[PDB]
Design a protein around this ligand. Structure first.
Ligand SMILES: OC[C@H]1O[C@@H](O[C@H]2[C@H](O)[C@@H](O)[C@H](O[C@H]3[C@H](O)[C@@H](O)[C@H](O)O[C@@H]3CO)O[C@@H]2CO)[C@H](O)[C@@H](O)[C@@H]1O
Ligand SMILES: OC[C@H]1O[C@@H](O[C@H]2[C@H](O)[C@@H](O)[C@H](O)O[C@@H]2CO)[C@H](O)[C@@H](O)[C@@H]1O
Ligand SMILES: [Cl-]
Ligand SMILES: [Cl-]
Ligand SMILES: [Cu+2]
Length: 235
């Protein structure tokens, strides 16, 4: 159970974005039905009044929280991967539009899941804004908690992979468009009951064997991190 509080741009806090530049759901409960319209941008997908200005190459940091800002972030049980996708905002997230900018699943070097590192990072993970066409975008940050993913939700709706999905409204101002955004995948649709990484038993299957759900990270993506970029406590 986790939500996005706001974003930072080049280590500058853009302030509380909830229902302002984040298409916030009413609560921190997961989405679990892979064919739900809620897979796009969670249960309250609508235009919110603001979009955060960035330029291509800026560091864009998502900041998550559990109940209050800079708390436990997400229950430690919720091991799993983190992904960020981008779509042009005029799509409203519909159609074959979501392009993956970031994936971090299980780090063999550190012996840690992305969610474990997200907690240590005070809820912060970042992407480099890609060199796409200037305009309005949705950045869809997705945490998959796998602690009940040994079952398919479609088998047992009390369990299943849990999707913590948050869509931020981002406006890309200065961009040379050196990597034009291609068509992408649909949400709902890209993940199905047979997709690798959706049904996974963390109690019996080694995390060294985990394969995150496709699609692969786009060739135009410039990278990211899971690391504290701003100190919320200094405010
Ligand atoms: O036993 C089932 C799994 O429970 C996980 O804890 C979650 C609780 O089941 C869930 O009820 C709770 O929901 C809270 C939420 O955390 C809080 O922010 C909100 O204000 O109220 C909700 C309703 O009470 O969330 C927790 C996760 O934080 C365990 O983490 C898991 O190990 C266990 O299998
Ligand atoms: O961040 C580690 C993560 O990498 C995933 O592979 C990606 C990689 O992030 C990206 O830089 C490159 O451009 O594409 C590949 C393929 O999608 C990998 O799937 C994860 O297991 C791993 O934790
Ligand atoms: Cl939960
Ligand atoms: Cl959310
Ligand atoms: Cu939870």
């Amino acid at each position: 159970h986790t939500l996005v509080w706001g974003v930072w741009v080049n280590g500058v806090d853009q302030g509380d974005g909830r229902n302002i530049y984040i298409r916030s759901p009413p609560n921190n409960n997961p989405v679990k039905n892979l064919t739900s319209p809620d897979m796009t941008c969670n249960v309250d997908n609508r235009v919110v009044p603001k979009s955060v200005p960035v330029n291509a190459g800026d560091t864009l940091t998502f900041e998550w929280y559990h109940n209050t800002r800079d708390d436990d972030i997400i229950a430690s049980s919720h091991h799993g991967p983190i992904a960020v996708y981008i779509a042009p905002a005029a799509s409203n997230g519909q159609g074959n539009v979501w392009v993956k900018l970031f994936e971090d699943a299980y780090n063999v070097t550190n012996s840690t899941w992305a969610v474990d590192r997200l907690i240590t990072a005070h809820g912060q993970h970042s992407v480099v804004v890609p060199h796409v066409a200037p305009g309005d975008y949705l950045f869809r940050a997705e945490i998959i908690a796998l602690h009940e993913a040994d079952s398919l939700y479609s088998q047992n709706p009390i369990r299943g992979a849990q999707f913590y999905i948050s869509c931020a409204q981002i406006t890309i101002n200065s961009s040379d468009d050196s990597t034009p955004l291609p068509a992408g995948v649909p949400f709902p649709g890209a993940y199905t009951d047979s997709t690798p990484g959706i049904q996974f038993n963390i109690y019996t299957t080694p995390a060294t064997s985990y394969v995150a759900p496709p699609p692969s990270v786009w060739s135009g993506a410039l990278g990211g991190s899971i690391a504290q970029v701003g100190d919320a406590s200094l405010e």
